[PDB]
Amino acid sequence: SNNVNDLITVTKQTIKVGDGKDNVAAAHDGKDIEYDTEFTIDNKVKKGDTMTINYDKNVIPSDLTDKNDPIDITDPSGEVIAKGTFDKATKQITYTFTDYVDKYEDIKARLTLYSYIDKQAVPNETSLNLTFATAGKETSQNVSVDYQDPMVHGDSNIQSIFTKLDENKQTIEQQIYVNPLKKTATNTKVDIAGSQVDDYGNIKLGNGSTIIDQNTEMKVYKVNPNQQLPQSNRIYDFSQYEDVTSQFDNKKSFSNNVATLDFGDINSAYIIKVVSKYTPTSDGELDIAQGTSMRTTDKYGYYNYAGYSNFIVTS
Which family is this sequence assigned to? Predict the structure, then answer.
């Protein structure tokens, strides 16, 4: 048994920003990174031999979990050419060839892997050089990390993402930025609903779900005028923020899987951390959707509504 990278000829390999919604196996809002590679395998290659694939230092196979089990290399009919394991330390997949390389000759293959930008290493929008490898053969692509923009309607401005999924305890962590433009906002109500929500806060039932109620964990933090939030929408160190949770003890109400936080008149940004429970489908898949909205009142007394919605739907 031996490493046969040298016996792998790389025919094509491209790196591009893709849309997470198109990752059918694990669909979620936001952008991903797509590594598409094609190669032929020398006939001398045999079962138990190995080749490797290298991820860029700044990506991870999933940015919601550590279930880092890579997809098999398969032929067009889905027959398995090789099974892989991910090494987090080296950021490299080691693929082990099955008997397929013994049953067949002049084998060629295609592999498309999905990964995600490490939001801790890349907290803000920038351009960055990514480097992957098939069988030690490297390619590099410059991409631009776009992060999402807040949805803004008058003074209502809001955005959110999922940051962490725990399949064992069946919870999902969502981080919400309230008034990240640090506007002056009057009679601010923030809703968190265990359902999809459109850009104007209208709740859309049936398209995924979480449980939002009394027991849902909900921390709130106030941001200083001089602190700028990571455009990634993901906070890694809450110590640096003023924890104002207990001030919402008597400004929280629950009705039909929706939480309402009475923020009142405000002039700062806030962060909400929500850890909520979900229920997987009967077939064991995921169908998580959770949304938030900000309502403010403008100088003429009209309501303005801004909504934001995240999801995870697997297959």
Answer: Belongs to the serine-aspartate repeat-containing protein (SDr) family.
